[PDB]
Every structure is written in C-alpha cells, then in structure tokens.
Write a protein that binds this ligand. Structure first.
Ligand code: HEM
Ligand code: HEM
Ligand code: HEM
Ligand code: HEM
Lengths: 145, 141, 145, 141
C-alpha cells in the first residue's frame, strides 16, 4: 500500500517488537476496553476484571498467536489479501467474528505500540501503522459473505 | 433529543405502519442481511433464507419492541431496560450494527409509505432509531 | 467490486431513474436529515426549514448536477476511480468536503430510490446499490491527501 | 456512563498530564492530521506544518476544554454547553471525526505516560472521551 521508504520504516520498526508481549497486551486491552469482544472467548475462563483478563494465560497465548499471524503479514505488505484469504474464510464460516473487531484490535495495537515505544513511535510512524492495520483489517474482512 | 415535533412525527408514522409492523420488521432484517452480510455473523443458528420462519419470527419481536418504544417515547430507557441488559450482557452486538438495521428499516418504511415518508418524517425517524440504538447499547461498558 | 450480473442488474434498473427529480430529492433530504451538511451551501439561500430546503431552486439545481455525475459513473462501473479522480481532487483541494458526506448522500439516495420505486426496489436490488454507492463514495475520496 | 471508578481514573491520569496538557493537545492534533488526512478539510486556513503556532494555539484550547471537562465529570453537558452550541451551529464537524481525535489523544497519552496508562485507565479515558464526543454533537439535530 505504502511507498518503498514507508515499507522500509515499518519493516525496520517491526523488527524491534516483542510479539508475545505486545500480542498478549493488545488482546488483553481489547477485552477490557471493549468488553463485548469477550463474547468469543468465554472458554478462556475468568474475564470479569482487568486483572483477570491481563493475567489470563489463554488470552496471553492467543494474543501471541494473532500477532505472529500479523507478523506474517508484515512480510507481505504487497499481498495482504492473499496472505489472509484462508484466515478470512475461517473467521467468517467457522468463528462468526464480526469484522468490526478487526478494526478495534488494529486501533488497540496502535495504542500498545505507542505505550511500549514512547517517543520512538512518531506521528509519521503512527501514520504508517494506521495504513497497515487498516490494510490487515480489510484483508481479514475480504472473504466474508 | 426528540423534540415535541419529533415525537408527533414518530407516533403519526408508526400509526400508519399499524398492523404491518411485524411484516416490515422481517423485511428490514432481510434487507439488512443481503446488504450488509457481516450482520449475519450474529445469527449462525438461523435459517437466513428468503421467508424463513425464524426471520419472520424475529422481525416481529423487533417490531414489537419498536412499537413499545413509540408508546413510551418519553422514557426509552425504562421502556427498553431489559433489551438493554440483553444486548449488553448476553448478545454483545457491536454498536455499528445498530446503524445498519436502522438504515434497513428506513428504506423499508420509505418503500411502503411513499406519501407519508416526507423529509421531516424521515429526519424524525432517523433520530428516533438513533436514540433507540443509543439506549440499547448504553450498558455495554 | 460488482459482478457482471450485479452490473447488469444495476445498469438495467438505472435506466428508469428520473435523475433530475431524484437528484434534487436526495440532496434535499441530506440537508434536512443531517443538517450539519448545510455548512457547504450557505450561498444557496434559506435552509431554515424542511420546506425551504426542499423548494430551494439551488438545492434542486445542485442535486441534478451531482446526480448527472453519478449517472456518468454508472456507465463506468469498471473504473470508478479513473472517472472520479479529478472530481476527488477538486472536492479535497477546492471544496474541502469531508468524504464522510459522500457516504451520507449514498445512503439518502438508496432511501430515495426506495421511496420512488416501492416494491420494485427489492432487497437484492438495494444490496447491489449499497455496493454502488460505496464504490462511488470511495472513488470520490480516493485522492484526499 | 462514567462509573465512580472511571471518574477516579480520569482525575488521576489527567492529574499526571498536568502542565503538559497544551503540548499533548498540539501533538494529538498533529497525529490526527497525519493518520487521518480527511480531518484537514475542517482547517482550510490553517498552517498545518509541523510546529505551526496555529496548531499549538488550537491544541491548547482543546486541552483547556478537556481540563474543564475533567473538573465537572458529573456535569459534562453543563460544562461544555457553549462548545456544543459552537460545534452544532457553526463548525458542523461530522460526528465521525470525534473518534479520530479521541484515538489520537489516546495514542499521545500512552506514549507520554507508559507506566500510568494501565488497561483500566485506558478503558476509563476511552469512555470519558466518548462521553465528551457525545456531548459535543448532542445539539447537531
Ligand atoms: C486482526 C488480526 C487477527 C489475526 C491475524 C488473527 C489470526 C488468528 C489466527 C492465526 C487464529 C488461529 C486459527 C486456527 O485455529 O486455525 C485465530 C483464531 C481466532 N480468532 Fe482471530 N485474528 C485476528 C483478530 C481477531 C479478533 C479481533 C477476534 C475477536 C475479537 C478474533 C477471534 C478469534 C477466535 C475466537 C479465534 C479462535 C480461538 C480458539 O482457538 O478457540 N481474532 N485468529
Ligand atoms: C432497533 C434495534 C434492535 C431492537 C429493537 C432489537 C430487539 C431485540 C429483541 C426484542 C430480541 C428478542 C428477545 C428474545 O426473544 O429473547 C432481540 C434478540 C436478538 N437481537 Fe436484537 N434488536 C435490535 C438490534 C439488533 C442488531 C443490530 C442485531 C445484530 C445485527 C441484533 C441481534 C440480535 C440477536 C442475535 C438476538 C437473539 C436471536 C435469537 O437467537 O433468538 N439485534 N433483539
Ligand atoms: C457523492 C456524489 C457526488 C458527486 C458525483 C458530486 C459531483 C460534483 C460535481 C460534478 C460538481 C461540480 C463541479 C464544478 O463544475 O464546479 C460538484 C460540486 C460541489 N459539490 Fe459535489 N458531488 C457529490 C457529493 C457531494 C456532497 C455529499 C457534498 C456536500 C454535502 C458536495 C458538495 C459540493 C459543493 C459545495 C460543490 C460546489 C458547488 C458550487 O459550485 O457552488 N458534493 N460536485
Ligand atoms: C474532544 C473533542 C473536541 C474538543 C474538546 C474541541 C474543542 C474545541 C475548542 C475549545 C475550540 C475553540 C473555540 C474558540 O474559538 O474559542 C474548537 C474549535 C474548532 N474545532 Fe473543535 N473540539 C473537538 C473536536 C473537534 C474535531 C474532531 C474537529 C474536526 C476534526 C474539530 C474542529 C474544530 C474547528 C474547525 C474549530 C475552529 C477553529 C478555527 O478555525 O479557529 N473539533 N474546538
């Protein structure tokens, strides 16, 4: 989507992300800030308080999983659609996940990166990531019917 | 905030719907499912084919709720307290979906009441539906 | 975005629309239902009431103008982007029109089509138009920077 | 609806912003302009260059309004009435833009207070901003 310099910037920045950590953090924050998203993770156990969510080992593991998958996309910024085609299909037909959730997670992801990288997460860098999370959300929404 | 004039328009227009309310609710649902396929993610255990009993049954409940709201325009929050708790604590339908059903309903009213669906009624209905949506999602967090 | 079939169905239906009438109505309803949209048409005159807006000769003239352009788009369903690229630019650089407005107008237009065609404007038809309106709003917002 | 807990969280977090409010205001705006360029259509006569006095000046006014919001958490509508009137009758900024500024502000706060921006505070600020947004567009129609 982005330019060759923007691609270079995002790539380089991403190489610094501690994916298990940022993953668990992002997923955990999503369940706390937008509690209705909890509807899909009832099996995860206790999600009643912020602490319960954030310390939940399954929220943790799942966050890791989602972000490893996201990282895969970071390697295919040119074909996000092809990359997430199988997963779009899965989220729709088997998990029945409203794609609106993908935007919510994308936005939470951006806040987490800002919290974790402080001043390094510049307004320009943020702009690049907004384009990415939007691109990913759209790729995942793509095979819905 | 529904003005005096808004309330009058809603009551008058709902009045013209009359007995077809159940019918319009089912059509709104169907229009919503074809137009915005993502809304179907909330009805996995439903038969969403054209004319499904499930869809007609649900449309009638939706409409019945709206009918209730129209009778208690001066207290939507009390009128809708249990559907509020139900959407917030059990269904947990993402808020954007309310906009989609609303639109779908307006299109339904428009196609069935060409003469009563004036610009001013359009505007009061749009506001009413938004208000209803706000009340249904008020206990989400 | 539309299939050959959807295109065919939409094209065939479009040939019944009385563009002038529908255009003035759509623009008029937009100014009445979402009054903040009035911000760009101060020069049109009186917009104080539903009646002032609906009978305003400028609203009507402008409504037609927009709808003719829309009709032009209907003849180029395969390249909405190319067709509206210059208009996109113009709306951004000279008019300063928030692209969100394009979304509001697309929705009001589907409501107006319904009100004018009653039962002929079917659930399937409407679905097709929802796609059209979306693709147009997107082509018009595509050169914002 | 702000809970008692939300109100303590907002007061605490805003307390930590303290003297930097104006600065964070200017930075949230700058982030908004870059990530969501359509927001620029409302500032056609602004020098939007990085560091402009205009953006800094505007950033400070937005921040002062928020500070006033934080002080009257039990009367948002009364505390922000003049600003509702202004946005509703003159500015007429489409409601979607409020979510874009809220997000940008959230991003700014997180980068500046990493240790204080806990999941719970995040959730409370998000709700506070949503409530500020709602108040600001409540007179639109
Ligand atoms: C937006 C970026 C996302 C990516 C890349 C992603 C990716 C994945 C992957 C790789 C899996 C495992 C698939 C499998 O079991 O074969 C998965 C499962 C799942 N995802 Fe997504 N996901 C994303 C967002 C979301 C969101 C926002 C939600 C809902 C709030 C969600 C709900 C789920 C659920 C419920 C599962 C199945 C969990 C289980 O094993 O029980 N995902 N996702
Ligand atoms: C005007 C807006 C709405 C009203 C008045 C409304 C009202 C209702 C009512 C009265 C029920 C049935 C309660 C019962 O019989 O137990 C219900 C259930 C339900 N609603 Fe809502 N609703 C609205 C919007 C939505 C939206 C936008 C969606 C999602 C797209 C939705 C999804 C559901 C679902 C999935 C159920 C349960 C269906 C079942 O399994 O029987 N609702 N709603
Ligand atoms: C979505 C479909 C739309 C299309 C195809 C469209 C197309 C056009 C065209 C062809 C013109 C005239 C260009 C010229 O020769 O100067 C125009 C002008 C304009 N449009 Fe759009 N437009 C659309 C929507 C909107 C919306 C939603 C708004 C704002 C509510 C808007 C605001 C304006 C304004 C203010 C002008 C300038 C009128 C004047 O000269 O005083 N347009 N548009
Ligand atoms: C938390 C949300 C917001 C708050 C607290 C806020 C507050 C304010 C304040 C305090 C002013 C200055 C009034 C004066 O001149 O004395 C203002 C003006 C203005 N705001 Fe809002 N605002 C918010 C959201 C927005 C958004 C989202 C936009 C557009 C994206 C916007 C666009 C404007 C514009 C264009 C002006 C007038 C600036 C000028 O030309 O001098 N505001 N706002």
């Amino acid at each position: 989507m982005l330019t060759a310099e923007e691609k270079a910037a995002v790539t380089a920045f991403w190489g610094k992300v501690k994916v298990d950590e940022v993953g668990g953090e992002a997923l955990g924050r999503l369940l706390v800030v937008y509690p209705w998203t909890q509807r899909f993770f009832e099996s995860f156990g206790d999600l009643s308080t912020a602490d319960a969510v954030m310390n939940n080992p399954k929220v943790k593991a799942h966050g890791k999983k989602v972000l490893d998958s996201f990282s895969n996309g970071m390697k295919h910024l040119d074909d996000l659609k092809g990359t997430f085609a199988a997963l779009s299909e899965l989220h729709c037909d088997k998990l029945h996940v409203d794609p609106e959730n993908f935007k919510l997670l994308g936005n939470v992801l951006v806040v987490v990166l800002a919290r974790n990288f402080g001043k390094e997460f510049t307004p320009v860098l943020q702009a690049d990531f907004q384009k990415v999370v939007a691109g990913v959300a759209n790729a995942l929404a793509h095979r819905y019917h | 905030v529904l003005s005096a004039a808004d309330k009058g328009n809603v009551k008058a227009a709902w009045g013209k719907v009359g007995g077809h309310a159940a019918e319009y609710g089912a059509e709104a649902l169907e229009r919503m499912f074809l137009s915005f396929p993502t809304t179907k993610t909330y009805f996995p255990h439903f038969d969403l084919s054209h004319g499904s009993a499930q869809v007609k049954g649900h449309g009638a409940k939706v409409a019945a709720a709206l009918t209730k709201a129209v009778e208690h325009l001066d207290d939507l929050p009390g009128a809708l307290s249990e559907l509020s708790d139900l959407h917030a604590h059990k269904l947990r339908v993402d808020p954007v979906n309310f906009k989609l059903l609303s639109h779908s309903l307006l299109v339904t009213l428009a196609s069935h009441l060409p003469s009563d669906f004036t610009p001013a009624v359009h505007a009061s209905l749009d506001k009413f539906l938004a208000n209803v949506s706000t009340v249904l999602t008020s206990k989400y967090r």
